[PDB]
C-alpha cells in the first residue's frame, strides 16, 4: 500500500492548511464545556484542530477518511449547536467550503503514494 512517514507528513501539512482557513481560530481548541454547559446534550463527539493534531501524532489517522471524518465533525458539530444567524454557524459553512477544496487536493496526493 503505502509508507507511514510520508502519509503523516502529508496529514500534518493538510491540517496546517485547514487551520489557515479558520482565521478566527475559533476551532483551534475544544469548545469550553464549562462555558457551554449544555453542549454535550446536543453533541456526541466534540472535535477541534488541537485534538486532531494530538490524534495525528498518536497514529490514530492511518487513512485519509478517518482524518476527513474528524474535520467534518468540527464543521457539523458547529452547524448543529449554533443558530443559523450566528457568526459561528456561518464560519462553519465557510470552513466546509474552503476546507473541502484543501481536502480534495490532499487526497489526490495520498492516492499517489
Ligand atoms: C458554543 N460554541 C460553539 O458551538 C462553537 O462552535 N465554538 C467555536 C465556540 C467557541 C467558543 C465558545 C463557545 C463555542
Curated annotation (Swiss-Prot):
It is found in: Nucleus; Chromosome; Cytoplasm. Residues 2-106 form the Bromo domain. It comes from the Eukaryota. High levels in testis. Acetylated by KAT6A. It is linked to Intellectual developmental disorder with dysmorphic facies and ptosis: An autosomal dominant neurodevelopmental disorder characterized by delayed psychomotor development, intellectual disability, delayed language, and facial dysmorphisms, most notably ptosis. Additional features may include poor growth, hypotonia, and seizures. Scaffold subunit of various histone acetyltransferase (HAT) complexes, such as the MOZ/MORF and HBO1 complexes, which have a histone H3 acetyltransferase activity. Plays a key role in HBO1 complex by directing KAT7/HBO1 specificity towards histone H3 'Lys-14' acetylation (H3K14ac). Some HAT complexes preferentially mediate histone H3 'Lys-23' (H3K23ac) acetylation. Positively regulates the transcription of RUNX1 and RUNX2. Component of some HBO1 complex composed of KAT7/HBO1, MEAF6, ING5, and BRPF1. Component of the MOZ/MORF complex composed at least of ING5, KAT6A, KAT6B, MEAF6 and one of BRPF1, BRD1/BRPF2 and BRPF3. Interacts (via PHD-type zinc finger domains) with unmethylated histone H3 at 'Lys-4' (H3K4me0). Interacts with trimethylated 'Lys-36' of histone H3 (H3K36me3). Interacts with ING5; interaction directs BRPF1 to H4K4me3-enriched chromatin at the 5' of active genes. Interacts with KAT7. This is Peregrin. It comes from Homo sapiens. The lineage of its organism: Eukaryota, Metazoa, Chordata, Craniata, Vertebrata. The chain holds residues 627 to 739 of 1214 of the full protein.
Amino acid at each position: 500500500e503505502m509508507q507511514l512517514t510520508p502519509f503523516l507528513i502529508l496529514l500534518r501539512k493538510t491540517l496546517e492548511q485547514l487551520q489557515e482557513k479558520d482565521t478566527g481560530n475559533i476551532f483551534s481548541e475544544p469548545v469550553p464545556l464549562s462555558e457551554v454547559p449544555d453542549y454535550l446534550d446536543h453533541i456526541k463527539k466534540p472535535m477541534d484542530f488541537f485534538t486532531m493534531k494530538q490524534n495525528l501524532e498518536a497514529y490514530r489517522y492511518l487513512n485519509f477518511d478517518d482524518f476527513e471524518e474528524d474535520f467534518n465533525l468540527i464543521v457539523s458539530n458547529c452547524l448543529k449547536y449554533n443558530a443559523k444567524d450566528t457568526i459561528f454557524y456561518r464560519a462553519a459553512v465557510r470552513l466546509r467550503e474552503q476546507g473541502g477544496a484543501v481536502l480534495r487536493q490532499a487526497r489526490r496526493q495520498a492516492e499517489k503514494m
